[PDB]
Each structure stands twice: as structure tokens, then as C-alpha cells.
Amino acid sequence: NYPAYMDNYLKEVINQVEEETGYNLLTTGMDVYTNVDQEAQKHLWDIYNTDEYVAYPDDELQVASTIVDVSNGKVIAQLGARHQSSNVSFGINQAVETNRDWGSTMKPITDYAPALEYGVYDSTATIVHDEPYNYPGTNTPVYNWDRGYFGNITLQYALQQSRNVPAVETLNKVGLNRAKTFLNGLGIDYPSIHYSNAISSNTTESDKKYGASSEKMAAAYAAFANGGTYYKPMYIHKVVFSDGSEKEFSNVGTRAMKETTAYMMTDMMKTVLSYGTGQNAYLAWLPQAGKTGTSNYTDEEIENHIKTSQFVAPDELFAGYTRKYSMAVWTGYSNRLTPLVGNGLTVAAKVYRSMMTYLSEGSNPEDWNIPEGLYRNGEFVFKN
Amino acid sequence: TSSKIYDNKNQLIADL
Ligand SMILES: *C(=O)[C@@H]([C@@H]1NC(C(=O)O)=C(SC2CN(C3=NCCS3)C2)[C@@H]1C)[C@@H](C)O
Ligand SMILES: [Zn+2]
Ligand SMILES: [Zn+2]
Ligand SMILES: [Zn+2]
Ligand SMILES: [Zn+2]
């Protein structure tokens, strides 16, 4: 027996124990010590399943999210579903599932960070281009959400307004192979990468590690938070075996980007919340950064299954981090063909706001310190 | 057969 709110977390623990030990804890007696902050995890459950924190449009709208400790990659909370009146033990955990499109949340990690890392751009003020534009080697246009084009704009403003053209063009300038390598360093892979991946986590396999889940995004963004080191999501701290043996898991990280890249990304993503698309997550007292995401339906889907001229989306996504924690939030419906509408598109950011409030309140929320190699200027940050 | 699971504060949370 075990509490219901822990069902998702335990399922990953079970999977992670046998990955490292080769032993399934359900068939072998062992005491397993985990990274789950029980109080935080309960609060996540409170947010999903009550009225106290978030105004949901209906009871079938789904939320999946993972919260990570930015210093070690310990997953401290995870809930893959809300309102589940079907108690089969250790079911599909949507929080580690990579089969929903993470849309614009791919931009910082696939496009803009690599461009800064490999020195394609030199500052957050670099004039980038929002003009009519085709996917390289194709006649298909990269449309913006409004079908409009802003023209000559700063990098910062591009990311902040979440424009598509500058993102895709940036992926072309970094190069597909170079970008794939960058994503790998952040725990994300594709079997094959394509230019549509500048604005989509859409993939062919997703049998295993391919694409993006709240789990992988939490881990990926955590790198921005800590000056650019990636940690593997860890659910288990220590196992003690029936025969008295004990195995402790130390969490070691890998340099995923230069500290200047991290800082510059953070500095731009601060504005997403203040001046941009992320304004439902804004908190005056909390130094935090983040990126929003709204995936879209296909050509086949708009024609045949989706009937409306209202703004709709199968998936709404937020990915934010403070100095201490990283959180990726996915929202949507089980059936992708049930579209998010009006207030439903604000859930993802409001779930983030509520959880982050809880976790950061009471500490001294530290801001980020401008590192050696960068200097301030007006609204923007420049290299040396 | 008998596996115990503890949170980050070492207090039992599941017995499987
Ligand atoms: C990314 O997910 C898509 C892109 N980005 C995005 C977002 O949520 O950042 C949108 S929603 C769009 C921005 N917005 C505004 N409403 C009032 C003024 S700005 C609705 C957009 C679809 C990318 C895959 O297209
Ligand atoms: Zn609470
Ligand atoms: Zn409460
Ligand atoms: Zn251009
Ligand atoms: Zn291709």
C-alpha cells in the first residue's frame, strides 16, 4: 500500500532502481530512499486536484510537470495527471512521456543558446530577422502565429515575443549537427533532426528517450539556472539490499554550455515573464526565467477535425526556473483533438506560478550575477 | 516481496 499522489513518482523510482541495480523492487526486498520532497509533492497534488490555486475550465484538462533541484538534478516533485478515477497501479506517467509537442519551449535549447555558445550571435541585442522565410531547401513558409512579420528586431525581443522565423533561421546558422550535439548535452535526442525542430519537439520514435517531456525539459532548463551544467534526473538517493548491502547514488554533472551562454539566455528569458508571452507566471519578488509554448494542429487536423476560427492548441507549455528549482509544465487533453481554449491556455503558466510561489517564499531569492566575459548595456548584455 | 520506500527526509512513504 502507498498514497495516490505518489503513484507517478514511485513508477519512475521502480524504473530507475532496476536501470542501475538490475533488480525490480516489487520482486526483491529492498529499502529505497528517494529524492521526493513529500510536502512539495502534496502541494503539487493540491494545485492539480482542488480549486485553491488554479481556476480550471473543466475536470478532464490534464497537467503533467516535473520539478527539479537545479544543483543536483534531483527530481523533487512529479505528477503526470489530474483527476484519475481509475486506480490501476503505476500507469502511464505523462510527465516522462515525450509524445506531446513541446513547441516553442524548444527554442531556447535548440536555437538561441547554441547560437550564443558557438558564437553565431554576440549579444542579446543582435539584430535578428522576422521576414517572410522558408524552411531551408523547401517552399513551405515559416509562419508566425499572427501570420505577420515584425521585421528587424533584437534577439531578446524575438525570443520574448516568441517569433518563429528568427528561430528557424537561427537553427540554420548554428547548423543541424551542431544543434543536435548541444541538445544531447542537455539530455535530449532525436533519431533525426529537421528544421521544424526549431519550433517543435515533434519526433518519429519517442519509444524511449526521443523528444521532450516535462522531465527532460526540467533537466534541460536547470542547466540555464546553475551556470550551464546538466544533471541526469534522479529519483533515487540510496538503495539498501535484503542482504545488508548499500549502494548510494552520487549525482555528477556535465558542462553543457559556457556560463556566459547560460547567463545571456536567462537574462532574455527574464523578459518573457515581464514584457512577453509569460506574464501569467510573473512574480515581482522572485528572480526567475522561463519560456511559454503553444503547439498547433496539422494541415489534416485543421481541415477535418478542428472547426473554429478561435485561437486553439493541443498543447500549452511552460518551462521556468529560479535560482534553486526548475519546472516544466505540460497542459492539454488526453485526446489531442480536444483543443485548449481561452482560459485553458493560461493554466500551464498559472500552475507554474503557484508551485514556484510555494517553493521560493521564505528563502532569500538570489538573482544571477553577471559573469566574467559579459557586460551590461541599456536593456541588453554584450560579450567581450 | 517486502520493499520500503522513503522520501527525502527518510520517513516511510510506501511499502510494496
Ligand atoms: C510556440 O509554442 C509557438 C508560438 N509561441 C507562442 C507562446 O506561447 O510563446 C505562441 S502563442 C501566441 C503569442 N500570443 C500572444 N497573445 C497576445 C499577444 S502575443 C499568442 C505561438 C503559437 C510556435 C510553435 O508557433
Ligand atoms: Zn499547498
Ligand atoms: Zn492548500
Ligand atoms: Zn535573415
Ligand atoms: Zn530533414
CSV table of N, CA and C in Angstrom, one decimal, chain A residues 1-3 10 25 27-34 36-38, chain B:
chain,number,residue,atom,x,y,z
A,1,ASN,N,0.8,-1.2,0.0
A,1,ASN,CA,0.0,0.0,0.0
A,1,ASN,C,0.8,1.3,0.0
A,2,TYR,N,0.3,2.3,-0.6
A,2,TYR,CA,1.0,3.6,-0.8
A,2,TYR,C,0.0,4.7,-1.2
A,3,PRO,N,0.4,6.0,-0.9
A,3,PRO,CA,-0.6,7.1,-1.2
A,3,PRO,C,-0.7,7.3,-2.7
A,10,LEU,N,6.8,7.1,-7.7
A,10,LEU,CA,7.1,5.7,-7.4
A,10,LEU,C,7.4,4.9,-8.7
A,25,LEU,N,12.2,-3.8,-7.6
A,25,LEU,CA,11.9,-3.7,-6.2
A,25,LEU,C,10.6,-4.4,-5.8
A,27,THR,N,9.8,-7.4,-6.8
A,27,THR,CA,10.1,-8.9,-6.7
A,27,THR,C,11.3,-9.2,-5.8
A,28,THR,N,12.0,-8.1,-5.4
A,28,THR,CA,13.1,-8.3,-4.5
A,28,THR,C,12.9,-7.3,-3.3
A,29,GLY,N,13.2,-7.8,-2.1
A,29,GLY,CA,13.1,-7.0,-0.9
A,29,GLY,C,14.3,-6.0,-0.9
A,30,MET,N,14.0,-4.7,-0.9
A,30,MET,CA,15.0,-3.7,-0.7
A,30,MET,C,14.3,-2.4,-0.2
A,31,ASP,N,15.1,-1.7,0.7
A,31,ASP,CA,14.6,-0.4,1.1
A,31,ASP,C,15.2,0.7,0.2
A,32,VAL,N,14.4,1.5,-0.4
A,32,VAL,CA,14.8,2.5,-1.4
A,32,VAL,C,14.5,3.9,-0.8
A,33,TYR,N,15.5,4.7,-0.9
A,33,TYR,CA,15.5,6.1,-0.3
A,33,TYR,C,15.5,7.1,-1.5
A,34,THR,N,14.5,7.9,-1.6
A,34,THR,CA,14.2,8.8,-2.8
A,34,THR,C,14.4,10.3,-2.5
A,36,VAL,N,12.2,12.6,-3.4
A,36,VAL,CA,10.9,13.3,-3.4
A,36,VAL,C,10.7,14.1,-2.1
A,37,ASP,N,10.5,15.4,-2.2
A,37,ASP,CA,10.1,16.3,-1.1
A,37,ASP,C,8.6,16.1,-1.0
A,38,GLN,N,8.2,15.3,0.0
A,38,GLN,CA,6.8,14.9,0.3
A,38,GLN,C,5.8,16.1,0.4
B,1,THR,N,9.5,-8.9,-2.6
B,1,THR,CA,8.4,-9.3,-1.7
B,1,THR,C,8.1,-8.1,-0.8
B,2,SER,N,9.1,-7.6,0.1
B,2,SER,CA,8.9,-6.5,1.0
B,2,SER,C,9.8,-5.4,0.8
B,3,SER,N,9.4,-4.4,0.0
B,3,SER,CA,10.2,-3.2,-0.3
B,3,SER,C,9.7,-2.0,0.3
B,4,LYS,N,10.5,-1.2,1.1
B,4,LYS,CA,10.1,0.0,1.7
B,4,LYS,C,10.7,1.2,1.0
B,5,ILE,N,9.9,2.3,0.8
B,5,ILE,CA,10.3,3.5,0.1
B,5,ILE,C,10.2,4.7,1.0
B,6,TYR,N,11.3,5.5,1.0
B,6,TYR,CA,11.4,6.6,1.9
B,6,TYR,C,11.6,7.9,1.1
B,7,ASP,N,11.0,9.0,1.6
B,7,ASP,CA,11.1,10.3,1.0
B,7,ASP,C,12.5,10.9,1.3
B,8,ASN,N,12.7,12.2,0.9
B,8,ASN,CA,14.0,12.9,1.1
B,8,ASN,C,14.3,13.2,2.6
B,9,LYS,N,13.3,13.0,3.5
B,9,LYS,CA,13.5,13.2,4.9
B,9,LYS,C,13.7,11.8,5.6
B,10,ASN,N,13.8,10.7,4.9
B,10,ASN,CA,14.0,9.4,5.4
B,10,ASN,C,12.8,8.7,6.1
B,11,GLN,N,11.6,9.3,6.0
B,11,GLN,CA,10.4,8.8,6.6
B,11,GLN,C,9.6,8.0,5.6
B,12,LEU,N,9.2,6.8,6.0
B,12,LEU,CA,8.5,5.8,5.1
B,12,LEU,C,7.3,6.5,4.4
B,13,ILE,N,7.2,6.1,3.1
B,13,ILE,CA,6.1,6.6,2.3
B,13,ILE,C,5.4,5.5,1.6
B,14,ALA,N,6.0,4.4,1.4
B,14,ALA,CA,5.4,3.3,0.7
B,14,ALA,C,6.0,1.9,1.1
B,15,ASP,N,5.2,0.9,1.1
B,15,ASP,CA,5.6,-0.5,1.4
B,15,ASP,C,5.0,-1.4,0.3
B,16,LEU,N,5.9,-2.0,-0.5
B,16,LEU,CA,5.5,-2.7,-1.7
B,16,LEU,C,5.9,-4.1,-1.7
